Amino acid sequence: NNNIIKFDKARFTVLTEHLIRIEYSETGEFEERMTQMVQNREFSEVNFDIIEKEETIEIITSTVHLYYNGGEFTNASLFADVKFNFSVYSNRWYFGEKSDGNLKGTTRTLDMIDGECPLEDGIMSKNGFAVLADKGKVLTEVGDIAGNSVSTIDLYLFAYGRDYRQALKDFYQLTGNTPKLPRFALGNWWSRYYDYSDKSYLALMDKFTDKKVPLSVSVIDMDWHKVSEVPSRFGSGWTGYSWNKKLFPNPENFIDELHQRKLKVTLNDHPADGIRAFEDPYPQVAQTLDLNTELEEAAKFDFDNLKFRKAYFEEVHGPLEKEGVDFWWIDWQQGAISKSGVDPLWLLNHYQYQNAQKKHKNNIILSRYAGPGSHRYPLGFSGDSVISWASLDFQPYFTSTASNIGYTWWSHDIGGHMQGYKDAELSLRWLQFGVFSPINRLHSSKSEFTSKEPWHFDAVIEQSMIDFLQLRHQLIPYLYSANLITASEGRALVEPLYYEYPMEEEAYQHRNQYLFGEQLMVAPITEKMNSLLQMGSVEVWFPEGTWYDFFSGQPYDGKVSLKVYREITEMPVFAKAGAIIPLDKNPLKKEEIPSEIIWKIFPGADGEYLLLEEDNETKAEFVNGIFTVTSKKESSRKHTIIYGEHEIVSAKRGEFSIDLNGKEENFDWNFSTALFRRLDIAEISYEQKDEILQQLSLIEEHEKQVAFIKTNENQELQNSLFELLYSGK
Amino acid sequence: NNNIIKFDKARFTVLTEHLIRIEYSETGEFEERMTQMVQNREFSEVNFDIIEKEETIEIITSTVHLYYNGGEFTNASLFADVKFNFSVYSNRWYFGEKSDGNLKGTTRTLDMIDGECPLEDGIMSKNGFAVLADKGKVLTEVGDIAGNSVSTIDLYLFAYGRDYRQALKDFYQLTGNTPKLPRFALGNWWSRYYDYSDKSYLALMDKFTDKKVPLSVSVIDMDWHKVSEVPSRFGSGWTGYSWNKKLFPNPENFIDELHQRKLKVTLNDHPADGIRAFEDPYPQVAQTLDLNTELEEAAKFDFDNLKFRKAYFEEVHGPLEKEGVDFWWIDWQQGAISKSGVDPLWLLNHYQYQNAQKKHKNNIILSRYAGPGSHRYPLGFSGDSVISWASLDFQPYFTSTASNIGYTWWSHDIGGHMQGYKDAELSLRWLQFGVFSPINRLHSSKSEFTSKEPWHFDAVIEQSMIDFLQLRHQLIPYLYSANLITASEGRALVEPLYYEYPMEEEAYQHRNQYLFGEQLMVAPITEKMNSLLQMGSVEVWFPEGTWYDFFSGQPYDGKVSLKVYREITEMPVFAKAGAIIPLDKNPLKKEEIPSEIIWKIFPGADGEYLLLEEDNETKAEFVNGIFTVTSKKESSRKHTIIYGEHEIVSAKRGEFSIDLNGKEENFDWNFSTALFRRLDIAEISYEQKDEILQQLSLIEEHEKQVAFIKTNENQELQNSLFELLYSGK
């Protein structure tokens, strides 16, 4: 290509104006094969300039000067200046050195993490550049490990400035797009490390139905297989591939019952102790792998070994798949050691994801993060988080930041995995976040005390959990459409604020705040409520424009940073004037695609929404007060229209256009009602409640209502009252 | 041997079913010579299985699968699975990696340690396996350093599960048994970093006698030699080999006076500055080592050098030994550097222990820990601990954990060495521990304020210290018998609870609690007393069975974890029903072996005790209430029998049998007396004392006495009263 330049023992490939591959080869041969990370180096031709001398080369694009002075790559011989002024003297990359500015990415797991842990770098930087080292093995054409690259140094310099979305799109072009998820992945999952029987698991699935909680996925954790029944001469029962016949006497019939309830079924797989001589598949595996059965030779876990992988997929998983297991939960915690030097977690996710496509279209796994490019193998499984306010407070930041290395389908144990402390409000706050996260999978530890069942809790917590779990299914149309946008356009469902607002300092100062698809902005509450107010709070940054609480219609004039207060049953989620959000009208109804969609419109601006589905595209447009719905293909689907407060049209078939210029724009939300409710629940003096209600009702001028609350001795009560006055301004 | 297998460049030796040597050699030659650590690889033949293929080998014993995949040893090529289920996924050893579970061992020294310090691994693990790397030099047949092993990797995989005592016995078979100590080592030692004269040292030894404190050892610290009198051109006076003639004008006569008092004598040796030209032995050493005397060439410390070692033993130590020095206190603090790569501390302990056997049978040194196998050179000397409650609180755990690397004769500075803070109760608690430790050596810093003399303190502390110092000499028969059991059977005097109770979780949760020989269980108090109770406390785990306070007879029904309270003058030490403890009846009487033994019997079960002595074995048996004493050889020894409370037989000669079925089984200890004493000393309100005494006397039902104390506002007083109610149940 004209986009390739060789100099001394180095090779430079200008992939985009903002992305340069940098290689070193001792042997004069450079690597064309794919790697664990890189799937594609075919990019459209771009313009750049070169200054090539006897001893030095300079490559010049719109955004970077890359310099190479010959010899081995050192911090002195290989370095780059960006053509940006985001910093005073952090604008230079030096080979092998770290600079300030990296917005971070993700890490393997939250196992044993109570609150924060360190993250790896991503490709996004406030200073406009990042280097992504390719240290992986080469692949063959069909995707097996081929050994060591002949490019013994192979780097990708990203110099996208603060065009983070383009950086991520081009990262997906280099490393491969995220595959499409199946719609079932986006519903509620039930999971618990608990020794259910077939009977008690079905009873619980039937109780969810009776309780009006919709589920898409039934997880069965490790007590599906033998555990205490494993003789100790074999080691533990952590790894298992044999049903516990007491609990599951007829596994296929049990899985058939979950399938009749329209559930997908996954089993926990702890692979590290392989297939030992007590296991039901051991005689077949022993025959295939020529094991010494009289010395009970184990088929040890070895995902570098083609014959082992084949026996694992065909003879260990295969029989369980025939019984109706839909996909695999790979729960790998036993380290990064293999003879090849490839992390066994990477070998599991890569080969198991590929194997899962044989039985079902667009199938998934559930496994931990295996490094850059491992987004090709959804879903992410963060693991054994400690049950704490601190863990919840980290998790939104964790989730949105992961988009910076393209890993956009994290599934967290909703409510936390293990250890930690009981607090029903923590459980409820965690579920609110989970509903507005990539995947909503309830899971817990082996404790008798950690079930995430809503009815574990009091009547208030129970009803709120059921409400949010129903909301998750209402959101599946929006989630599935965003999923197809991830797969086709390389846009994350969960974005940090700085993707949309890269030049706004406040977009970097609200770590737990994020965009959720294109129409919603979420600010989860991740701190225990103030008992004096009976409300939790978070500081929300409202960008320029008019924003509405998604639930209440409470309005906010951006741009402003404002502390917002919500009761434990309520979550801060916001939509702009002109937002159009589809919702399943029948979230409890078992059906492949919604028979009815609610179009929820926020007045005050034009807008539009494209609902992508398996077999259709439906465009909702709101222009000069006219709402129009059209689709590629016709269907019997019935559309409901909600304009602000009011249901305008109920269950109307086919394409149509309705004029909403006539209709009531304003939500009911009003200062006086909200004021009365905040004062009423507060655990403060009745004399203070009486004085605040009286004075805020009597005082007419907005500035004097604010002066009145400014004298209040309760500082947090001032901030709560200020939120209502700001919304009522 | 059939117990030897070669594969690729590796050699495996199956020493036991649970112990495998693993070697790598580039040259095809493997090491048969002894090392600093390993003295013996002759073990009886054992059965095991092999699966040997073209590219891999598996060795299978009753407890482990060892795998080697060929090539250099890496975490991928060399690894082992244990045949135990003590953990879910910590059952695999990987070459060069650490696993969870190690119960730890010991470290060189407590120099400058205030409380806890990190310890090295031992051979014991809760998960059932440990690797002990042999990184030492090879020895010649006679025990000199021969250079580098030809086994450039040489490892010992221990896979004993929780059979910790067998692991330790087989470690002693590999590394050599601990030698027998001499009986004098087990008595009280006096030491102080203080510039005594011959006259003032003898006066102090005569004051111990007048004060009824028995001593076995007289330590003379570094002010024995010139210190301030050393010209500064030579460096410091820390190293010295020349008597200070002002303080010791006639050293042999002074040592003769200590010998007439039946004391053994040791001098501090700081070896690091060698033999400099001012020293009394320098002219002889200079002649032997061909030094340049007109340039005052020093004989620098060089224990790699055969001629230096010979001149050190014969011409430096030899003259002081002729004056009557019995053994050497090696106080080495000057680092681990030598030309050979052997730690100078190891060279000192190895060669000085060997040299000490020339002048006396079963002689000792006193020196810091020099790594695995250095138990062959007793005694351990932990050094310059900081005087603190924190240091004392670490020391029992430190001492029992050291058994896990076979280093079972730690001598700690009793009361702490230096710095820290005055607290007479800390001094008394420390001496209580020391009496129930491997060695009871009182020692202190150069301060005018840190003497460990009992009469330094008030009359209460003084009497209690004298009482415990007398108890140490009463215990010498028991200690000397345990010493011969260490030397002959490889059983530690001090064991962690988990040696006896490996499957009891509570045996891992009482770090300062230990077995002391086979008949006593000790729970030292290592925290300042609660001034409200005037008592200190420790949580004691009582194993299954009936236990008695060794001192009071207070009973405890196991299994239970119970906080116990003792006045500062009292120590928690416990014996089971059926325990038989010999005691010297005449601890102040200077005599080589006790002329009279008290047999202290705890009623309620059968038992037995074997008293091993220099020239006799005496068996005490208690079966169906009949007490029998027999011996290999006859003697004039007189036996006293104490059955629970009562002296049954006084000063009876020879073999005999007495029936104790007739005699009073029960101790005097009673709830009411103990209750009155705890309330009486407590610094609480008299109204509370009156109400507790009245209500606990009136309320008849045990459950209602416990309910009454459960309402007490003083939580620690509740726990103290609960201990008495539990013992009275």
Residue numbers in the entry:
A (entry chain A), B (entry chain A): 11 to 739
Mind quoting what the paper says about this structure?
Within this cluster, we showed that a GH31_u1 protein from Lactococcus lactis (LlGH31_u1) and its fungal homolog demonstrated hydrolytic activities against nigerose [α-D-Glcp-(1→3)-D-Glc]. The kcat/Km values of LlGH31_u1 against kojibiose and maltose were 13% and 2.1% of that against nigerose, indicating that LlGH31_u1 has a higher specificity to the α-1,3 linkage of nigerose than other characterized GH31 enzymes, including eukaryotic enzymes. Furthermore, the three-dimensional structures of LlGH31_u1 determined using X-ray crystallography and cryogenic electron microscopy revealed that LlGH31_u1 forms a hexamer and has a C-terminal domain comprising four α-helices, suggesting that it contributes to hexamerization. Finally, crystal structures in complex with nigerooligosaccharides and kojibiose along with mutational analysis revealed the active site residues involved in substrate recognition in this enzyme. This study reports the first structure of a bacterial GH31 α-1,3-glucosidase and provides new insight into the substrate specificity of GH31 enzymes and the physiological functions of bacterial and fungal GH31_u1 members.
WT LlGH31_u1 was crystallized in two different crystal forms (named, crystal forms 1 and 2, see Experimental procedures). Crystal forms 1 and 2 belong to the space groups P21 and P6322, respectively, and comprise six and one molecule of LlGH31_u1, respectively, in an asymmetric unit. The P21 and P6322 structures of unliganded WT (named WT_P21 and WT_P6322, respectively) were determined at 1.75- and 1.85-Å resolutions. Despite the space group difference, hexamer formation could be generated via the symmetry operations in the P6322 space group, and the hexamer assembly is isomorphous with six monomers in WT_P21. With molecular assembly in the crystal structures, LlGH31_u1 probably forms a hexamer. We performed a structural similarity search on the DALI server using WT_P6322 as a query. However, the superimposition of D394A-Koj2 with WT_P6322 shows that the estimated distance between the Asp394 and 1-OH of kojibiose was 1.2 Å, indicating a steric hindrance.
